Symmetry: C2
Subunit: 216 residues, 2 copies
């Protein structure tokens, strides 16, 4: 299916486009709210500035898709493939992104995506850039953040239980009131992140002290 | 006994002056090394710049004594009363000061040197040790209530079982100190350098907590 066809259909009030192939498509500025694009192929698709608010994108292939500046508020992205996707400035506030693959995804730079209150449970964000991103209130229970860039990323009140932050850059990260229990973190995180009211284990508290040079 | 008598005796090679009353005495600059002054009364004595190296001053009353700039290296001061004593610039390097009462004592505020001193069980409550050097000192079980340790150097010091409640610790260097079991305020965790400092599990927790972490 091409651009014109699908815009027409949406304008007619059609909302079921599930399984549709839209690889490489130019839907810049396109307005597709409430659209069911579950299981859709959008590999390398240009959705720059698109409005996808409340879309069903569950299981969609969005690898290396440009969503830069797109609206995805309360979109269902569970298990969506977003590997290498360009999301700088995207609004994912409230989105269901659980189990989604966001590896290598660019979510901001010295600009930042908004993921406030998003569900990122079990999401694979390994190697992702979230520098300056906003994840205030987000659920990252069990999320993989290996080698992720969280420089200046705001994670206040976020749930990082059981999360892996190995290799994550955390300079300027704000984890105040976050729940870190059971997360795997490098000792540098203790040195870099602000952690006021952050919730931790006993093992974590010890690690925190040790990371400041204390011996036991 | 007055000044002249005792200087003469020392110059003769007499060393036993134990129990001698020298209250209020002016022994500024006096040189009294190896002197046994155990149980001596030196209340409010001026010993400014005195050399007391290797003296036995055990149980001596040195309350409000001016020892400012005095040498006390390897002196035995165990159980000496030093309450309110003026010790700015004194060298107590290597001294046995255990059980000594140093409450209210001024040790720098230019500091005194207490390197490698034995301060076990010493009462230093309310003392001023600002800028003092206690590197390597043993303060096991010492009372440091409300002590000023601003910029005091306590590296490799033993603070096991010590009470530092109310102690000011801005700029304090506790690197490689042993803190196990010491009682400290949470502010100490915030203010002192603690690299290689040895701590309890309960201390590690308190440390985190003092940085705002919740359990």
């Amino acid at each position: 299916m091409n651009v014109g066809e699908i815009l027409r259909h949406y304008a007619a009030g059609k909302r079921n486009f599930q399984h549709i192939n839209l690889q490489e498509i130019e839907l810049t500025n396109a307005s597709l709210t409430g659209a069911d694009l579950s299981y859709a192929n959008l590999h390398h698709a240009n959705l720059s500035r698109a409005n996808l608010r409340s879309a069903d994108l569950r299981n969609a292939n969005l690898s290396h898709a440009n969503l830069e500046g797109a609206n995805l508020e309360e979109a269902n992205l569970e298990a969506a493939n977003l590997r290498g996707a360009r999301l700088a400035g995207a609004n994912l506030s409230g989105a269901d992104l659980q189990e989604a693959n966001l590896t290598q995804a660019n979510l901001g730079g010295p600009p930042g995506a908004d993921l406030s209150d998003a569900n990122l449970e079990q999401a694979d964000l390994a190697g992702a850039n979230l520098a300056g991103a906003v994840l205030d209130g987000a659920n990252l229970h069990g999320a993989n953040l290996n080698n992720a860039n969280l420089d200046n990323a705001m994670l206040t009140r976020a749930n990082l239980e059981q999360a892996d932050l190995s290799g994550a850059r955390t300079t300027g990260a704000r984890l105040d009131d976050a729940d870190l229990r059971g997360a795997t973190v490098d000792p540098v995180l203790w040195r870099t992140a602000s952690l006021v009211g952050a919730r931790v284990d006993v093992d974590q508290a010890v690690a925190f002290a040790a990371a400041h040079g204390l011996c036991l």
